[PDB]
Design a protein around this ligand. Structure first.
Ligand SMILES: O=C(O)c1cc(=O)[nH]c(=O)n1[C@@H]1O[C@H](COP(=O)(O)O)[C@@H](O)[C@H]1O
Ligand SMILES: O=C(O)c1cc(=O)[nH]c(=O)n1[C@@H]1O[C@H](COP(=O)(O)O)[C@@H](O)[C@H]1O
Lengths: 208, 208
C-alpha cells in the first residue's frame, strides 16, 4: 500500500462512494461492497479525484502521449487528471474525448500516438471495446487503461475483466486501489472486522 | 481592464485561440478577429482556462449554487472551473452536466437551486435555450451565464446576442473579455496598430 492509496480509500469512504453492505452487482452476485465513482459530484471531489489519478499515473511509469476520456463518464475525469498532471507534476498533455452522436467526432487534441485511456471502473469488459474502436480507428495505439478500482473477481470464466482487457487489447491496465489494498486497509481498522470477515469471505468465492 | 483579463488575452493570443486576419463569421460577416476556445486542447490550457473562469466568477459577485456545463463543449469547462474554484478560491460547488442522448439525464449533482451556466462564446443566442430548457425543466432557477468573449456586435436586430440572452431568460451574462478590452489591449501594443485600426473600424459598423 502506497500513501495516496491510503487517502484514496479514505477519500472514497467519507464520500460514501465506497460503501459496505449488501449489494447485488450487475452480474447478479451479491457483493459486500460497492464502489460508485458517480458520488464525486463537486469541485473538490473532482479536484482531489484527479490528484489521485495523476499519481497512479505518474507512480506507474507507463508512457503515453495523450489522455482519453470515454463517452460521458470519462470527460470529467480525463479533464481533472489533465489538470492535476499539469499543476502538480508539470506534465502537459493533450486531452481529448469522443462525441457520442448520431460519430468519432473527437473533442480536443489529435487522437495521434499513444493514448492513455482513463475511466472509473470496468466491470463488463465494456465501452473500451467502443472506446478502443475509435483509438484504433484513427491510427493511434493504446498504451493503457487507468481506473479507480480493480474489484479483482471472476467474470464468466476463470479470469477477470481487467485480465480480459489486458488479454484482448495487448494493453496494460493500471489502477488506484485493488481489492487487496481494500482488505489490507480493513486489517488496520479493527472495528471494520465485520466488513473484513465479509470481504475476506467474498474474495475467497470469487477472488481471482 | 482588470489583470486576469490582461493575461487572458495574452494567454488566448499565444495560444492562437485569438487570431487576427479576416474571418467570415457564421453570420456571414467578415470580422477581423476570431476567438476559438477549441484550441484549448491540453492539460495546462485547461488548467489556466479554469483559473480565468473562476476569477471572473468570483470577481463577479453574482451568486449561484451550482455549475452547469452544456452539451459537450461545456463539460471540460465546467469541470475545470469547478476545480479552479476549490483549489484556488475554496469554493466547493457541485457540478453537473447533461447527457445529449436519444434526454436530460444529468450527470453529477442535483439540478437544484441557482444554476450557473458556463460556456465558451455565444453567437447565435443558442443551446442556452436547450440548456436552459433542462434547468427550467427540473425546477432550478438560472443565475447566469459565464462566457469567455462578448464579441459585442449586432445580431439581426439592434441588440446583441448576449443582450438578447439577458433580455429573454431574465438572467445575467458575465464574461471574461469583451471587445472593448480587446481594443483597450491593442492600444498598448503599438505594433498591433493594423489590427487596431481594423477592429476599431469593425466595432463602428457593428459594435453594439
Ligand atoms: O456491478 C459491478 O460490477 C460494479 C462493481 C463495482 O465495484 N463498481 C461498479 O461501479 N460496478 C458497476 O460498473 C459500472 C461501470 O462499468 P463498465 O461496465 O466497465 O462500464 C457500473 O454501472 C457500476 O455500478
Ligand atoms: O461566428 C461567430 O459568431 C463566432 C465569433 C467568435 O468570435 N467566436 C466564435 O466562437 N464564433 C462561433 O461561435 C460558435 C459557438 O457558439 P453558439 O452559437 O453560441 O453555440 C462557433 O462555431 C464559433 O466559431
Amino acid at each position: 500500500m502506497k500513501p495516496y492509496q491510503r487517502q484514496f480509500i479514505e477519500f472514497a469512504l467519507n464520500k460514501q462512494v465506497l460503501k459496505f453492505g449488501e449489494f447485488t452487482l450487475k452480474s447478479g452476485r451479491k457483493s459486500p461492497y460497492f464502489f460508485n465513482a458517480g458520488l464525486f459530484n463537486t469541485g473538490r471531489d473532482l479536484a482531489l479525484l484527479g490528484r489521485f489519478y495523476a499519481e497512479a499515473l505518474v507512480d506507474s511509469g507507463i508512457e503515453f502521449d495523450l489522455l482519453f476520456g470515454p463517452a460521458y463518464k470519462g470527460i470529467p475525469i480525463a479533464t481533472t487528471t489533465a489538470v492535476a498532471l499539469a499543476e502538480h507534476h508539470d506534465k502537459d498533455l493533450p486531452y481529448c474525448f469522443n462525441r457520442k452522436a448520431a460519430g468519432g467526432s473527437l473533442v480536443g487534441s489529435a487522437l495521434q500516438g499513444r493514448v492513455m485511456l482513463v475511466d472509473d471502473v470496468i466491470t463488463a469488459g465494456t465501452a473500451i471495446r467502443e472506446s478502443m474502436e475509435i483509438i484504433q480507428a484513427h491510427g493511434a495505439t493504446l498504451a493503457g487503461v487507468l481506473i479507480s478500482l480493480d474489484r479483482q473477481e471472476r467474470g464468466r470464466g476463470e479470469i477477470s475483466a481487467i485480465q480480459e482487457v489486458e488479454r484482448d487489447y495487448g494493453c496494460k491496465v493500471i489502477s488506484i486501489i485493488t481489492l487487496k489494498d481494500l482488505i489490507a486497509y480493513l486489517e488496520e481498522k479493527p472495528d471494520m472486522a465485520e466488513h473484513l470477515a465479509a470481504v475476506r469471505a467474498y474474495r475467497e468465492e470469487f477472488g481471482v
